[PDB]
Design an enzyme around this catalytic site. Sequence first.
Site, mmCIF file in Angstrom:
data_model
loop_
_atom_site.group_PDB
_atom_site.id
_atom_site.type_symbol
_atom_site.label_atom_id
_atom_site.label_comp_id
_atom_site.label_asym_id
_atom_site.label_seq_id
_atom_site.Cartn_x
_atom_site.Cartn_y
_atom_site.Cartn_z
ATOM 1 N N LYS A 189 -11.688 -10.292 -54.136
ATOM 2 C CA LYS A 189 -10.210 -10.361 -54.091
ATOM 3 C C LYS A 189 -10.707 -9.789 -55.357
ATOM 4 C CE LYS A 189 -9.342 -10.358 -49.602
ATOM 5 N NZ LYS A 189 -8.858 -8.891 -48.578
ATOM 6 N N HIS A 192 -12.259 -5.469 -39.473
ATOM 7 C CA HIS A 192 -11.339 -6.566 -40.275
ATOM 8 C C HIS A 192 -10.562 -8.170 -39.487
ATOM 9 C CE1 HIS A 192 -7.142 -8.535 -40.893
ATOM 10 N NE2 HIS A 192 -8.208 -8.435 -42.257
#
EC number: 4.2.1.156
Lengths: 395, 395
Positions: A194, A325
Amino acid sequence: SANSDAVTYAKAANTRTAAETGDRIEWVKLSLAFLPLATPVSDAKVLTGRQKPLTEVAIIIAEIRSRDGFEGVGFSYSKRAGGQGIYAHAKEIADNLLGEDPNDIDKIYTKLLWAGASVGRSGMAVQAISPIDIALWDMKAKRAGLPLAKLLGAHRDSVQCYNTSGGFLHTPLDQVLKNVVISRENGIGGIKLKVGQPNCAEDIRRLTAVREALGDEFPLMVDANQQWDRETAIRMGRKMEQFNLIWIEEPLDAYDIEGHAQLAAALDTPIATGEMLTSFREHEQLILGNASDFVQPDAPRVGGISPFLKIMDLAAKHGRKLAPHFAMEVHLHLSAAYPLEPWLEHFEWLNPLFNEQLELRDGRMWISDRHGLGFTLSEQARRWTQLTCEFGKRP
Amino acid sequence: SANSDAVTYAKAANTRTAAETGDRIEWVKLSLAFLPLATPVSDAKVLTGRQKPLTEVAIIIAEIRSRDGFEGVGFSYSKRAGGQGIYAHAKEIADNLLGEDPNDIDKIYTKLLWAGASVGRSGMAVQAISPIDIALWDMKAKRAGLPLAKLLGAHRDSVQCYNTSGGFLHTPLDQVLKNVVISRENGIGGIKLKVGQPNCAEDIRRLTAVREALGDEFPLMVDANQQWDRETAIRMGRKMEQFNLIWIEEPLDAYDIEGHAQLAAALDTPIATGEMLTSFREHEQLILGNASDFVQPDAPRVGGISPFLKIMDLAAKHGRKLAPHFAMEVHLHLSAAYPLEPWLEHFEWLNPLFNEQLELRDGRMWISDRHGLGFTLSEQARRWTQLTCEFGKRP
């Protein structure tokens, strides 16, 4: 002779029709559960102040049973606000299912849309249909004695898998590196980190470290969760070209189509996006606008397996790769059915909800011989259930 | 908790995979048969001198049996030259089916395309895959214990049906009128008249006589089989607007996209076309070009059910109606699964190839409770077989 000077019509013997012999939905149960996350989770959305840390996940489950003895299970979810509304709408439309032939999935989906015509064909309302649509597909696969991937038709029996849960921004670099070792020792096939925090230098610091530990070849990817503006995106993109990333995910706002396309055309590194979209129509716009190299639909978010199939087909026509996802329990099957080599995302978050666990081996997640989605609800799933309702009568 | 400060990986109990447990094809039988037509058939293609009257129909049949006891049957056809080639190619690639998991239909299709990569992805070669693809869908439906339409998911239990057999150009007017009576008496829902002969005056004459006999409401349609040039097409189109036809089929060459699009935009009467196309890609060019209001694909001709499904999805996305050509034994199931109200075309030609017959009632053809396509090969189909070959060993 098969014809004559006139026209002849045959007389049928088996006067029995598909309408009069088909199965029928007799019972439906909906549940709103909450999956607690002991360690609050933060991605770029939190560090920029757009949201608060994630402490739990709403899970909306649908269980359907037919007259002839078949059952299906499916679910949708919500991270942050949304679960109450998904459950509430599902509860308000669920009884429309009673008496329907469970095999006519799209016909049922349409009936559910008309029953709630006032609230649209995208967004939360379709996410309330997701659990039901998925349960119906789970049922059909079981009816055929096949894992969902085989009912749809598979192109592969296992799918490349990368981990996301060990690379969040609330995690110190030293721990992220510890997670990489743990994940790799467990046979993971890739790592996603991230990024997109205000301090760009830090993200580069973290990314260089991860790549350093992984080695030049191990698949590595990044996710900005829409937190960069266009200037920052291209800038960071140029800088990251050196890491040979599988992709750069959500560098910009999920609806910035031209911004993504511009980024995808300027960098050799693939661009990925789509997890936040909530319908086929939304994904279509991104796809027609050449927004990304990788399309990342979310079955629960787009309205279920039915719209996800349409999304996959469109992406395939445009030669895009697929990287669904979350919800690997459902996406495993969908990605296995995709024509081009896909990627599967891993989180251990939903593991407690099911009695079965997927097999991670040599970088890939394998499709088991279990039918439908291949999962059964656990005691814990019931313990975490906060609201439930039923319709019809258990056959 | 569902998460931690690090990352955790569960452990799968079950270890069997879909790969190792899936069914397997072990035997395949291909047949080339000829369906005789004692009454030579000719449409505008014959009256303009392009072709000779039709006197028989080539039928290529595929029968597949799996290790676990499942069986599937499917077929393709050729009207005039083409059947010897379809059968010959099917025979040269069929062996590739042995050892394949029959559920991975697209996966097998792709393998068959690579096995014959030299001969393309459209035309006669995909029509050689058609019997096989269709048989695989027949098998999958039967495996689910459902009629094919139900495996696909239906939007209706029956389909509006019109007759074509009794409206050909080699049939004198009085006989065409007698067939209309016979057809309407047998519960037909519509009548299509063949037009497009050199004598435009004789076509208007026949059409006026038919509308007169049917009354102002009964569904009436016409088919020129590509025999008009753009000038004649528009002139005849203006003149036919008074008959309130359901559609005007193939007014021009099957590949004249702008020509069809121009007629469709200029006329209120719907324009239909597509029967001659032989691939998804060909149909796609016509659809993207807004060529017609009704899309008329032919599963046998486009490569089977798999490509027919993609065609249907594309047509639906463009808001077009569906009216499949011929092979009602297969198209009944496909049209049942179409979201918008479709039309089914009737011919009695293939009736003798199967032991079962379809139920025609109140202008619609009904889907029976029989599984898969719902048809078994008759003894007559064997009598009409001229060539056959087998691969593998019956289970």
